[model samples]
Target chain A: PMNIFEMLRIDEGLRLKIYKDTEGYYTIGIGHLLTKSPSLNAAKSELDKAIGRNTNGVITKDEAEKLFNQDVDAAVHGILHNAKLKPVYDSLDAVRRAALINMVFQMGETGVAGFTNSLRMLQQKRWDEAAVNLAKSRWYNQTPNRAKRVITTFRTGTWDAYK
Target chain B: PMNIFEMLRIDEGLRLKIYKDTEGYYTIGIGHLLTKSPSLNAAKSELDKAIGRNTNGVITKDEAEKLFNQDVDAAVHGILHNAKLKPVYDSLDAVRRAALINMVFQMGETGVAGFTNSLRMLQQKRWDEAAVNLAKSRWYNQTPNRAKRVITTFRTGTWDAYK
Candidate 1:
């Protein structure tokens, strides 16, 4: 099966080094934004303990790959069930389906759902027009490079340019 | 058999509501600073799961308290054994000793270590001079409310205003 996960990994690209996402969340691996959770909460306390200790405070590339799988797993499922566009989304080829999931991952399912006109174009099989409408989005302006790749895939029905 | 935990709690004040700490770390329950750990690396991902999924995406107050104890337990011991001021730290009245630990908890051990002149005055058993020196520092100006109470406790060996 040509899974969307395989396509998404190439689209997002892997970053072993920790850095801030476009929205200012501390992220590492393939877009894993950090938050205080049950297991890790005391930042200063940990820093305090580490000051006299030896640790890089980052994860390995192998660790990053594992985190991405977990992160993308639910996101892919969420996109597959998007009622407003699932029929159009499911009708697309694997590459186009991956592009749609990428859009949901970049923004969110709710955010992607707001693009009624663009979804209408996709549903009506106006493929080129759908891709153009996506390029004109505020999110596209916010992240042009990423949009170029996703929009290219949407238009070309292939992941060649993105890879 | 006195402890700084009780005193520091009085200084930081108990907070039931989840809020951001002065340093912008998400915090709750009397200054328990939040950090991104192995499991909880994405707030947005969790929030997305929670938005319509009947999840709060945060721990209980009891959990917060347990986390605070784990954080402060080590911090208190670290301050108690701080080489820079340990001798003077051991000589102070309970309230004054507690005041020093409160400062370390607010700032880290290294932060409190920078108060060389104030520590010197404390080492010399000059209560008024030490209090004045603490009041003159940048930390005092940065967190004046906490500083005022800590300074008062240092001077009079009392926690009346804070408690």
Candidate 2:
């Protein structure tokens, strides 16, 4: 079975594509994904015209949206966090923090860095700083409702860090 | 609220400072928070010594592992994901993808392309593509497990392109 990590990149890739592609234009398609009927159609039509102009006719809102609308086989996965590391990690005490930052940068909120401030706090043993920093990232912003997570993993060793 | 994006960078800056200040040597202080306790302490300590020397005392293994432990976070944030358009992304649809890729190259994946492929994926809402591309780099591939989780988030758009 595909573990959570395996599935993370797929959607991450999609979002990157959207951000890169849209540039600054507020995408209407994602907003439309919420609806199935005429709502989708209206959004598609609007997007088609916009995309058509942007693509220089390469992509029409209708066709592109249609392709996009066509639901593909998707699965749910959590941010994959690489828990194991090479024996080398033990030796490089300095790189350890950087490596974590890099990991979190990849994984997301639950991943290594989780959030920048959280990472900083963790490295510094500033549990509150780390937690507060962790709480600030776009992930937290994306889902403000579920912020009390990472209780077990983040505070595993430094229970005092949280205090 | 701190909002997710700012939260990450705010702390990431500190992590980078530690690495940069240390100048590539292994460190047991910042990133090595949990490294001291993991079962691999021996290796962690050994690796830390070597890493410190290799980084010229800039990045240590313990620090590195601690940082890497947060790989998901680092990848999520470190990405120089073209948070803002450079210019080419706005030119045309056909080359828009190219522009975003360039941005990724510029932003780097492990300092090579800070943005990962995130800049490209975000524009098009091709969440899967974006996530995959994020892993298509030197740093993101550290652990296979790490790759999987990131891919899952990308495909699902649940992690919001590692943001």
Candidate 3:
């Protein structure tokens, strides 16, 4: 099985220079959202601490990697701490669990949680129905290619998408 | 609005001695589940530290109050962190929020999250329907009086139950 961290690294490609996301949020270092900090200056302070040097606008690969690890940890904890998702999450096989975690990584816990019917189908072990429900979302329309692979992974419980 | 801490103290009723709950789980200090600790010795060690004395089977009133405060904190965090519940919880008023928190205190986050249909009604602000759905549960059967008050509070968005 591919490590979830490595899989997320592939999905959310690393960048040393800060950039804005599709939603125009300030981001850097493997999709780490700088806007999540209280202020850009605060985020910069964190980056400086992580890099052990004052950063102008770019970070080392090691800093990016470090941030990625922390972000993955946050995503996982967010998923597990979620009351509604925890039981269903606990019931999944490793591949499917990784797929769900991947979804949380991309969309956040709240974003992924809006698929209520899909999560119900997942709880019932109706993979095909769950995938169908997921496919019907605006998320699917926005990221058709990524959604298809993720939806397929959920449907089949395989590493094919990551492969 | 009534303080959630005070309301819980009224409902849970502080206990200074370790005792088994209805389900025979080790409980003490205003519904703190000692079984949640790694082991009985671990739970006892925690009690000892909190009380500043070797606890045979009892704790001080202050120790009980401290544990109660911590438990309340855990329940609040659990409710807010629930992916499916957070939005619905946020939409509620203080009284209704206390009602929901009270339920979480009694049943834990996962247990309350199981009320899918009821929670949906809550999200939609169909208070009567939500209360009706809650009343249909085995929980209602087990703790008829407490459940009734909680359900009525949910329906009316009032603190009458607590009062």
How much lDDT does each candidate structure score? 0.63, 0.36, 0.75
Q: Give the TM-score of candidate 1.
A: 0.42
Q: What lDDT tens digits, residue by residue, belong to model 3 across residues B1-163?
A: 2456556777777788887777766778888777755466777776676556898869876567656655655676676678876656655655577788899889889999889889889977899999888999999999998899889989997667777
All candidates: DockQ: 0.01, 0.05, 0.02
lDDT of 3 by residue, A1-163 (tens): 2456556777777789877677766678777877654466777776677566899669877567656655665676687678777656655655676788888999999988878889888867799998988998998999888788889989997767778
Q: What is the docking quality class of candidate 1?
A: incorrect
Best candidate per lDDT, number?
Answer: 3
Q: Arrange candidates, best TM-score first.
A: 3, 1, 2
Question: Fraction of true contacts kept, per model?
Answer: 0.00, 0.06, 0.00
Better of 2 and 3 by DockQ: 2
Candidate 1 local lDDT, A69-160, one digit each (tens): 44554565565456786655644544576688788886788998999998888756688998889889998898888788888888887766
Candidate 1 off by > 4 Å: A1-11, A36-56, B1-163
Q: Which order, best to worst by DockQ?
A: 2, 3, 1
On TM-score, the leading prediction is 3
DockQ of 1: 0.01
Model 2 lDDT per residue over B1-163, tens place: 1122222222232242232122333223333322333344443455445344433224533454445434433333333233354222332232123223222332344453355356556556676677667667654555344344445544563433334
